[PDB]
Symmetry: D2
Subunit: 303 residues, 4 copies
């Protein structure tokens, strides 16, 4: 293994070209992105056999300073004329390999830094502000891209993946976990109605990488839309386990977006422990946080 | 100083009585709380001279186990019939002092654990789910209450405070910071148009503590409404500093809620450093995260 | 309330004047600080009635920028000729009030950023390579005011140790507490008590905190080692009982101190396996999040 | 991909069999582990084609509950008769596949929860009181599969040290790098290089990782001390240059290792004061968030 790069390259751009012309789905009102504020956290990794002596001999002759990669990323966000994190990564990668001929491979991660709208009164009415936004520490979109230079100096994308990270969903009822193995290691009680609490990271891959860029936006799959599928399927489903849930979410995603090849899930169980099962004159209950150990599932659904 | 207690007492209740009948303000659509899910993180501190020997002699005869205070809090959330964190704290405090006659003072903090609604399709339409909610790691409401037992065994509230914590607001333009002291310690440039980024914790105190409980909900001041005042004033104001901003927010709060005695602000500056000032054929710019040191302000506005 | 300032002012100084000549105590090997690397995280807060219009009118005429406060602190760490965080805070405080006549009060916190020695090869401690520690760290607090007669006065000073996490595998009990409708906790005659400790002390004479007479300076390193020694020596009956005895020992070792203040938290593990064949050992695991805490002052 | 499991399975064992008889090296005083307190955080992941319907149909017939996996790991720490995290992982892996015939693969991570000795009073290290450390910690990884012939086989094993944060105040340069339209970084012939290191190693013979023959076990404590020694000895020309030399030294000291893998990060401070009167010292501060990193393998 041999690579190096720069992490936590935060870059905030105002007034990126808006994302419009997207194709809608029943589960989501998503219709585009205003891009008044477009925030991204970028990680860049680069490799190539010509970097060996930077490690083995301390020769920096062919070392692009990681500080310079930070400058490269932030300057290119200024000159980017597209509309997606996916397309920004392609722009950075192609530009970087064109600039640095001795680099053979580049890998990029971009993580959205999301901002939400806020209310303001003006000119007689209250409406969403075009100026004041709220930084969100909840779920966020992600993008990943790897690009290589071939022997003939052409550049090729070798992997692309989009995603939604940090989605934390609790469904208060309509979930069971029963019928699992009950042996000498089992102390979990069967539960016909638990408040299942899942953390979800959902990643998708396109059949055709061009559809990830937003250039023909009707072919773009938006993380907002993926979020809303996940919440809708969770609501619709009398869940039998997280495993059961995530497969159903993945099936719906691939049905809604035939241009996707597959969807991958990383789920975690964070379901609360129950403290009060019955409350006089109410269907309510009381729960609290569990001990630290958390279940998890990793699963791919393909077309 | 002598007290002890329990922190991070998470308690989640389903189907608390809804909060309705509130009085509206121009800055906010807030009209109440459904309370399908009501989550609170409680810290309890207790004191009293009769606790001395628990420290000086290792005598636990009069020690309420902190583990038992956790049970006390979680059981009382089950039996609570009111509609606010403020009222829940009063219920816990009065109940605890009534139960433990040797305790002379109790202090409680309650922090909302907020959940947001999500979309689901069902019966032909898409609408907010009554079952699936999204845990939010953004701003949250807070409540504080201190209660004492008097020599005659009556109980009195000695301090009450409500709040909104963790509000992170960025306004992309319409903010200046110019005219500050420029001496041998000054390297900050004057800036006539910066993207001011503030973290805000806003705390308010009522003229009459009863108005905090929600029993007559038209007198309750909701953290949601305070949030929307803050965003509206930020939008409306050509800010001259954070100091200038927070005073204006506080004035609006006290004008909208004459039943409040004062409002207190803890603000932090997290404004990004500018990297690209000019972008061809665009009003946009590029910024990035600053170094760690952060400015802050603490200020009270009173009626 | 009306004040403003700057937090997370990190400053790292190499080769500060070493702290030498400190009085040692039985419990600790501490005898000074080499100060090859001196790291401190400073927070400054300033007040004054003349700041009012910076809020009420947006007038920045009398605003020292918080960014400039950061420069002030960093430049003063370069010119500081002393040997303690406590003394550095006094230097900053006096310099700032002398510079800015419209400021009536200044509050400072300094938190050590600790670095530990490492081995380099015969093996010996390196004088160049250090290990950044995320464990316990020393702290200092100072509040200084301008009086009506233009004299400057320290109104409060406090040193401390923060982030000390100690677990004693045996020799701790918690029994005899109240058992009623809300008590589910079992009594335990031998628990592996795990405590987090923040310990703070005040001097009888604020000058002793500066280190100018090193014999009268109380080092957070020595407080740490007192706490571990007393924990080891004591068959604890509760955290309350433990911290009282720690405080008593500190005050006995440092008669120049007026008080010791404790903030403790209980993080004891849940026991899962009570008996292991042919062993005295047990298996424990992490508890649920709720944590007990205590706050207590011992006075000289 | 199809697997599931349990993370953050904390388990603390008192009085595990001590690790004795380890081979020492010049760079480290390490010679064994008392194991009065043995803390490990385990993550388990399991796979098998027969799990498919637990996803596609909601059939829990063949689901070992992740909660039960937690019980499995904790109970096996109580019955473990060995002396290393690496060996404990092998014990868990083999036991789990032997128990559950429908599981075809198991992956385990174990992360040490480290505790340091403290002083108790003559002053001496306590045998009861320990300090929880949030600094560097040892790690272990193991993957085991069931073959078509029902034999069990370890397909991957890796030990490591994580979270090592080292700063060398002088004796480091970074010069000669590419200078073009994107380069603003100044060359530096004497910088206080601050690196975070995660170091991982693989054995030629997976059995050497278990500790059964302690002479062949490579301790994370010894890797730590090699890293600090090499850092001290080397006039570094970059982090790339440093980690190569660290790797070479590790492989020279432990011929039983096949490779050493590094993940490093640059956290060097920005310099604010270049010269202080009558001192060799300087003042630095924390940089902006973006951090450089390197990843490199050295092979025997
Ligand atoms: O949904 C779940 N899947 C599982 O595998 C599991 N194990 N414990 N709880 C669980 N819940
Ligand atoms: O709004 C601000 N107030 C201040 O006091 C300040 N100081 N630096 N930047 C600042 N911004
Ligand atoms: O030392 C303790 N003091 C306490 O008050 C307490 N309460 N639960 N456990 C406890 N342990
Ligand atoms: O050691 C370093 N290697 C690098 O590649 C680099 N880039 N910026 N600074 C650096 N330091």
């Amino acid at each position: 293994v041999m690579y190096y790069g720069k992490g936590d390259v935060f870059a905030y751009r105002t007034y990126l070209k808006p994302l419009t012309g997207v194709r809608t789905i029943p589960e989501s009102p998503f219709s585009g992105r205003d891009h008044i504020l477009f925030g991204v956290n970028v990680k860049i990794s680069v490799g190539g056999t010509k970097l060996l002596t930077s490690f083995t001999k301390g020769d920096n002759s062919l070392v692009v300073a990681t500080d310079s990669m930070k400058n490269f990323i932030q300057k290119h966000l200024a000159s980017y004329t597209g509309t997606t994190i996916e397309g920004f990564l392609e722009y950075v990668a192609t530009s970087f390999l064109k600039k640095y001929s001795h680099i053979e491979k580049i890998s990029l991660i971009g993580e959205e830094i999301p901002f939400e709208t806020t209310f303001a009164v003006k000119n007689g009415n209250r409406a969403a502000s075009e100026l004041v936004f709220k930084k969100s520490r909840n779920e966020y979109a992600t993008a990943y891209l790897n690009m290589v230079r071939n022997e003939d100096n052409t550049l090729n994308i070798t992997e692309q993946q989009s995603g939604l990270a940090g989605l934390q969903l609790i469904k208060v009822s309509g979930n069971s976990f029963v019928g699992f193995i009950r042996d000498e290691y089992t102390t979990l009680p069967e539960d016909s109605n638990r408040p299942l609490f899942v953390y979800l990271n959902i990643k998708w891959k396109y059949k055709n990488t061009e559809d990830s860029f937003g250039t023909n936006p009707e072919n773009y799959v938006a993380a907002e839309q993926i979020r809303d599928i996940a919440t809708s399927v969770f609501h619709e489903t009398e869940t039998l386990s997280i495993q059961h849930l995530i497969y159903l979410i993945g099936r719906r995603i691939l049905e809604r977006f035939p241009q996707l090849q597959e969807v991958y899930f990383e789920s975690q169980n964070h379901t609360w422990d129950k403290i009060v099962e019955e409350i006089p004159e109410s269907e309510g209950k009381v729960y609290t946080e569990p001990r630290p150990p958390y279940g998890f599932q990793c699963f791919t659904v393909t077309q």
